[PDB]
Design a protein around this motif. Structure first.
Motif, PDB file in Angstrom:
ATOM      1  N   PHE B 104       7.624   3.450   5.543  1.00  0.00           N
ATOM      2  CA  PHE B 104       6.940   2.172   5.386  1.00  0.00           C
ATOM      3  C   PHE B 104       7.873   0.982   5.594  1.00  0.00           C
ATOM      4  CE2 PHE B 104       5.155   5.433   2.449  1.00  0.00           C
ATOM      5  CZ  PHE B 104       4.072   5.776   3.235  1.00  0.00           C
ATOM      6  N   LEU B 152       3.881  -4.299  -8.483  1.00  0.00           N
ATOM      7  CA  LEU B 152       3.306  -4.040  -7.157  1.00  0.00           C
ATOM      8  C   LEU B 152       2.490  -5.199  -6.605  1.00  0.00           C
ATOM      9  CD1 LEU B 152       2.045  -0.377  -7.495  1.00  0.00           C
ATOM     10  CD2 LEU B 152       4.234  -1.146  -6.532  1.00  0.00           C
ATOM     11  N   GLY B 153       1.968  -6.044  -7.487  1.00  0.00           N
ATOM     12  CA  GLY B 153       1.004  -7.065  -7.069  1.00  0.00           C
ATOM     13  C   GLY B 153      -0.115  -6.502  -6.211  1.00  0.00           C
ATOM     14  N   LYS B 154      -0.516  -7.269  -5.198  1.00  0.00           N
ATOM     15  CA  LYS B 154      -1.441  -6.823  -4.176  1.00  0.00           C
ATOM     16  C   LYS B 154      -0.742  -5.865  -3.234  1.00  0.00           C
ATOM     17  CE  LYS B 154      -4.623  -8.267  -0.590  1.00  0.00           C
ATOM     18  NZ  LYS B 154      -5.321  -6.959  -0.679  1.00  0.00           N
ATOM     19  N   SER B 155      -1.135  -4.599  -3.267  1.00  0.00           N
ATOM     20  CA  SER B 155      -0.405  -3.564  -2.545  1.00  0.00           C
ATOM     21  C   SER B 155      -1.162  -3.139  -1.308  1.00  0.00           C
ATOM     22  CB  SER B 155      -0.167  -2.355  -3.448  1.00  0.00           C
ATOM     23  OG  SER B 155       0.832  -1.506  -2.922  1.00  0.00           O
ATOM     24  N   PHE B 156      -0.467  -3.082  -0.181  1.00  0.00           N
ATOM     25  CA  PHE B 156      -1.043  -2.625   1.083  1.00  0.00           C
ATOM     26  C   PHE B 156      -1.173  -1.117   1.067  1.00  0.00           C
ATOM     27  CE2 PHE B 156      -2.016  -3.395   5.520  1.00  0.00           C
ATOM     28  CZ  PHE B 156      -1.797  -2.147   6.089  1.00  0.00           C
ATOM     29  N   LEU B 157      -2.390  -0.601   1.282  1.00  0.00           N
ATOM     30  CA  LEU B 157      -2.649   0.841   1.208  1.00  0.00           C
ATOM     31  C   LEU B 157      -2.454   1.478   2.580  1.00  0.00           C
ATOM     32  CD1 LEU B 157      -3.401   3.144  -0.709  1.00  0.00           C
ATOM     33  CD2 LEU B 157      -5.795   2.755  -0.125  1.00  0.00           C
ATOM     34  N   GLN B 158      -1.487   2.381   2.665  1.00  0.00           N
ATOM     35  CA  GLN B 158      -1.198   3.144   3.861  1.00  0.00           C
ATOM     36  C   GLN B 158      -1.568   4.581   3.581  1.00  0.00           C
ATOM     37  OE1 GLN B 158      -0.664   3.639   7.286  1.00  0.00           O
ATOM     38  NE2 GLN B 158       0.656   1.869   7.052  1.00  0.00           N
ATOM     39  N   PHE B 159      -2.541   5.108   4.314  1.00  0.00           N
ATOM     40  CA  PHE B 159      -2.920   6.492   4.206  1.00  0.00           C
ATOM     41  C   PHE B 159      -1.855   7.176   5.071  1.00  0.00           C
ATOM     42  CE2 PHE B 159      -7.214   6.193   2.153  1.00  0.00           C
ATOM     43  CZ  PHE B 159      -7.298   4.818   2.093  1.00  0.00           C
TER      44      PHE B 159
END
Ligand SMILES: CCOc1ccc(-c2nc3ccccc3c(=O)[nH]2)cc1
Ligand SMILES: [Zn+2]
Lengths: 47, 162
Positions: B104, B152-159
Protein backbone atom coordinates in the motif's frame (compact mmCIF):
# COMPACT_ATOMS: atom_id res chain seq x y z
CA UNK A 1 6.95 8.46 3.01
CA UNK A 2 3.99 8.48 0.57
CA UNK A 3 0.84 10.57 1.16
CA UNK A 4 -2.48 9.15 2.33
CA UNK A 5 -5.05 8.89 -0.47
CA UNK A 6 -6.70 12.33 -0.85
CA UNK A 7 -9.46 12.78 1.72
CA UNK A 8 -8.11 9.85 3.85
CA UNK A 9 -5.83 9.48 6.91
CA UNK A 10 -4.77 5.84 6.47
CA UNK A 11 -5.20 2.74 4.30
CA UNK A 12 -6.83 -0.51 5.37
CA UNK A 13 -5.62 -3.69 3.66
CA UNK A 14 -8.62 -6.03 3.71
CA UNK A 15 -7.75 -9.65 2.96
CA UNK A 16 -9.70 -10.96 -0.15
CA UNK A 17 -8.30 -14.58 -0.43
CA UNK A 18 -7.28 -15.94 2.98
CA UNK A 19 -10.48 -16.08 5.01
CA UNK A 20 -8.55 -16.36 8.29
CA UNK A 21 -6.29 -13.30 7.93
CA UNK A 22 -7.06 -10.13 9.85
CA UNK A 23 -6.65 -6.61 8.48
CA UNK A 24 -3.41 -4.67 8.08
CA UNK A 25 -3.19 -0.87 8.18
CA UNK A 26 -0.87 1.86 6.92
CA UNK A 27 -0.36 5.40 8.20
CA UNK A 28 1.70 8.06 6.44
CA UNK A 29 2.37 10.31 9.45
CA UNK A 30 4.42 8.91 12.37
CA UNK A 31 2.43 11.16 14.74
CA UNK A 32 -0.61 8.90 14.15
CA UNK A 33 0.82 6.07 16.30
CA UNK A 34 2.03 5.79 19.89
CA UNK A 35 4.06 2.72 21.00
CA UNK A 36 2.02 1.92 24.17
CA UNK A 37 3.39 -1.50 25.10
CA UNK A 38 6.73 -3.22 24.54
CA UNK A 39 6.25 -7.00 24.61
CA UNK A 40 9.24 -9.31 25.04
CA UNK A 41 8.61 -12.93 24.05
CA UNK A 42 9.72 -16.14 22.44
CA UNK A 43 7.89 -18.12 19.82
CA UNK A 44 7.11 -21.64 21.12
CA UNK A 45 7.94 -24.83 19.22
CA UNK A 46 4.73 -26.81 18.56
CA UNK A 47 4.52 -30.07 20.55
CA UNK B 1 12.48 11.06 27.95
CA UNK B 2 11.17 7.47 27.69
CA UNK B 3 10.74 5.29 30.74
CA UNK B 4 9.59 1.68 30.68
CA UNK B 5 7.34 0.41 33.45
CA UNK B 6 7.08 -3.33 33.96
CA UNK B 7 3.59 -4.75 34.30
CA UNK B 8 3.04 -7.54 36.76
CA UNK B 9 1.57 -10.72 35.26
CA UNK B 10 -1.12 -10.41 37.96
CA UNK B 11 -2.20 -7.02 36.51
CA UNK B 12 -5.42 -7.04 34.42
CA UNK B 13 -3.62 -4.79 31.92
CA UNK B 14 -0.83 -7.36 31.43
CA UNK B 15 -3.45 -10.08 31.02
CA UNK B 16 -5.54 -8.24 28.39
CA UNK B 17 -2.42 -7.35 26.33
CA UNK B 18 -1.13 -10.95 26.52
CA UNK B 19 -4.57 -12.24 25.44
CA UNK B 20 -4.57 -9.98 22.35
CA UNK B 21 -1.04 -11.18 21.50
CA UNK B 22 -1.87 -14.89 21.89
CA UNK B 23 -5.38 -14.88 20.38
CA UNK B 24 -4.33 -13.18 17.15
CA UNK B 25 -1.74 -15.77 16.10
CA UNK B 26 -2.55 -17.39 12.76
CA UNK B 27 -0.92 -19.62 10.20
CA UNK B 28 0.93 -17.82 7.40
CA UNK B 29 1.02 -18.64 3.69
CA UNK B 30 4.82 -18.93 3.82
CA UNK B 31 4.61 -22.00 6.09
CA UNK B 32 6.62 -20.11 8.74
CA UNK B 33 9.46 -18.96 6.45
CA UNK B 34 9.55 -15.35 7.65
CA UNK B 35 8.33 -15.51 11.26
CA UNK B 36 8.92 -19.11 12.30
CA UNK B 37 6.73 -22.11 13.08
CA UNK B 38 4.54 -21.63 16.17
CA UNK B 39 0.96 -21.50 17.44
CA UNK B 40 1.62 -19.46 20.59
CA UNK B 41 4.20 -17.38 22.45
CA UNK B 42 6.02 -17.47 25.75
CA UNK B 43 5.49 -13.92 27.02
CA UNK B 44 8.53 -12.88 29.06
CA UNK B 45 7.73 -9.24 29.83
CA UNK B 46 5.19 -6.51 29.06
CA UNK B 47 6.31 -2.92 29.63
CA UNK B 48 4.32 0.32 29.40
CA UNK B 49 6.17 2.91 27.33
CA UNK B 50 5.94 6.36 28.94
CA UNK B 51 7.09 9.50 27.15
CA UNK B 52 5.18 12.74 27.71
CA UNK B 53 6.49 14.55 24.58
CA UNK B 54 5.72 11.60 22.29
CA UNK B 55 2.27 11.18 23.88
CA UNK B 56 1.46 14.85 23.35
CA UNK B 57 2.64 14.58 19.73
CA UNK B 58 0.22 11.68 19.30
CA UNK B 59 -2.79 13.39 20.94
CA UNK B 60 -2.20 16.62 19.01
CA UNK B 61 -2.41 14.73 15.71
CA UNK B 62 -5.34 12.62 16.98
CA UNK B 63 -7.34 15.80 17.63
CA UNK B 64 -6.51 17.13 14.13
CA UNK B 65 -7.73 13.87 12.57
CA UNK B 66 -10.84 13.67 14.75
CA UNK B 67 -11.80 17.22 13.83
CA UNK B 68 -11.51 16.28 10.11
CA UNK B 69 -13.68 13.18 10.64
CA UNK B 70 -16.84 14.13 12.60
CA UNK B 71 -15.07 13.90 15.96
CA UNK B 72 -13.97 10.30 15.32
CA UNK B 73 -10.26 9.40 15.53
CA UNK B 74 -11.03 5.77 14.63
CA UNK B 75 -8.37 4.69 17.11
CA UNK B 76 -7.22 1.06 17.17
CA UNK B 77 -4.71 -1.01 19.15
CA UNK B 78 -2.45 -2.75 16.62
CA UNK B 79 0.82 -4.68 16.49
CA UNK B 80 4.10 -3.46 15.01
CA UNK B 81 7.23 -5.52 14.47
CA UNK B 82 10.45 -3.87 13.37
CA UNK B 83 14.21 -4.01 13.68
CA UNK B 84 13.91 -0.39 14.92
CA UNK B 85 11.78 -1.03 18.05
CA UNK B 86 14.40 0.60 20.31
CA UNK B 87 14.57 3.73 18.17
CA UNK B 88 10.78 3.91 18.07
CA UNK B 89 10.20 3.79 21.80
CA UNK B 90 12.76 6.57 22.40
CA UNK B 91 12.21 8.90 19.44
CA UNK B 92 8.72 8.06 18.15
CA UNK B 93 7.56 6.75 14.81
CA UNK B 94 8.75 8.68 11.72
CA UNK B 95 9.62 8.18 8.01
CA UNK B 96 12.70 6.04 8.88
CA UNK B 97 10.30 3.37 10.22
CA UNK B 98 8.26 3.07 7.00
CA UNK B 99 8.08 0.01 4.81
CA UNK B 100 9.12 1.65 1.57
CA UNK B 101 8.20 -1.41 -0.54
CA UNK B 102 4.89 -2.22 1.14
CA UNK B 103 1.90 -3.13 -0.99
CA UNK B 104 0.00 0.00 0.00
CA UNK B 105 2.95 2.36 -0.60
CA UNK B 106 5.66 3.76 1.63
CA UNK B 107 4.14 4.18 5.07
CA UNK B 108 4.23 2.64 8.54
CA UNK B 109 2.48 -0.72 8.67
CA UNK B 110 0.49 -2.29 11.53
CA UNK B 111 -1.30 -5.60 11.92
CA UNK B 112 -4.30 -7.03 13.78
CA UNK B 113 -2.54 -10.43 13.76
CA UNK B 114 0.42 -10.37 16.15
CA UNK B 115 1.95 -13.18 14.07
CA UNK B 116 1.97 -10.90 11.02
CA UNK B 117 4.04 -8.30 12.89
CA UNK B 118 6.26 -11.15 14.17
CA UNK B 119 7.35 -11.69 10.55
CA UNK B 120 9.10 -8.27 10.63
CA UNK B 121 10.95 -8.42 13.97
CA UNK B 122 14.17 -9.43 12.14
CA UNK B 123 13.48 -7.32 9.02
CA UNK B 124 11.42 -7.61 5.84
CA UNK B 125 10.71 -11.29 5.17
CA UNK B 126 12.32 -12.09 8.52
CA UNK B 127 15.70 -10.96 7.09
CA UNK B 128 18.35 -13.51 8.08
CA UNK B 129 16.67 -14.42 11.37
CA UNK B 130 17.97 -13.85 14.86
CA UNK B 131 21.42 -12.18 15.14
CA UNK B 132 22.86 -15.02 17.31
CA UNK B 133 21.77 -18.13 15.37
CA UNK B 134 20.67 -16.71 11.95
CA UNK B 135 17.38 -18.58 12.46
CA UNK B 136 14.04 -17.01 11.44
CA UNK B 137 12.34 -19.73 13.56
CA UNK B 138 14.61 -19.30 16.58
CA UNK B 139 12.92 -20.58 19.76
CA UNK B 140 15.75 -19.35 22.02
CA UNK B 141 16.28 -15.67 21.25
CA UNK B 142 14.09 -12.99 22.79
CA UNK B 143 11.92 -11.04 20.39
CA UNK B 144 10.12 -7.76 20.87
CA UNK B 145 6.87 -6.41 19.41
CA UNK B 146 5.05 -3.14 19.99
CA UNK B 147 1.32 -2.96 20.75
CA UNK B 148 0.46 0.50 19.55
CA UNK B 149 -2.33 3.05 19.73
CA UNK B 150 -3.05 4.06 16.13
CA UNK B 151 -5.27 6.81 14.71
CA UNK B 152 -6.82 5.66 11.43
CA UNK B 153 -9.31 8.48 10.83
CA UNK B 154 -11.03 8.08 7.47
CA UNK B 155 -9.38 4.95 6.11
CA UNK B 156 -9.12 4.02 2.43
CA UNK B 157 -10.35 0.43 1.96
CA UNK B 158 -8.16 -1.69 -0.30
CA UNK B 159 -9.46 -5.17 -1.01
CA UNK B 160 -6.30 -7.26 -1.57
CA UNK B 161 -5.32 -10.83 -2.37
CA UNK B 162 -3.72 -11.79 0.96
C1 LIG C 1 13.25 -1.20 6.63
C2 LIG C 1 11.92 -1.94 6.84
O1 LIG C 1 11.19 -1.30 7.88
C3 LIG C 1 10.02 -1.94 8.18
C4 LIG C 1 9.51 -1.89 9.47
C5 LIG C 1 8.31 -2.54 9.79
C6 LIG C 1 7.62 -3.25 8.81
C7 LIG C 1 6.39 -3.89 9.08
N1 LIG C 1 5.59 -4.21 8.06
C8 LIG C 1 4.40 -4.80 8.27
C9 LIG C 1 3.62 -5.11 7.16
C10 LIG C 1 2.38 -5.70 7.33
C11 LIG C 1 1.91 -5.97 8.60
C12 LIG C 1 2.70 -5.68 9.71
C13 LIG C 1 3.94 -5.08 9.56
C14 LIG C 1 4.77 -4.78 10.65
O2 LIG C 1 4.45 -5.01 11.82
N2 LIG C 1 5.99 -4.17 10.39
C15 LIG C 1 8.13 -3.28 7.52
C16 LIG C 1 9.32 -2.63 7.20
ZN1 LIG D 1 18.51 -17.22 18.07
Amino acid sequence: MAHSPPGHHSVTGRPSVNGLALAEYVIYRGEQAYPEYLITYQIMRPE
Amino acid sequence: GTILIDLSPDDKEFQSVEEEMQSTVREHRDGGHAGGIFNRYNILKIQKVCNKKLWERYTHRRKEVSEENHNHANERMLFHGSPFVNAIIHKGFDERHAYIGGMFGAGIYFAENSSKSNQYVYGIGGGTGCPVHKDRSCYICHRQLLFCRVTLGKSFLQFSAM
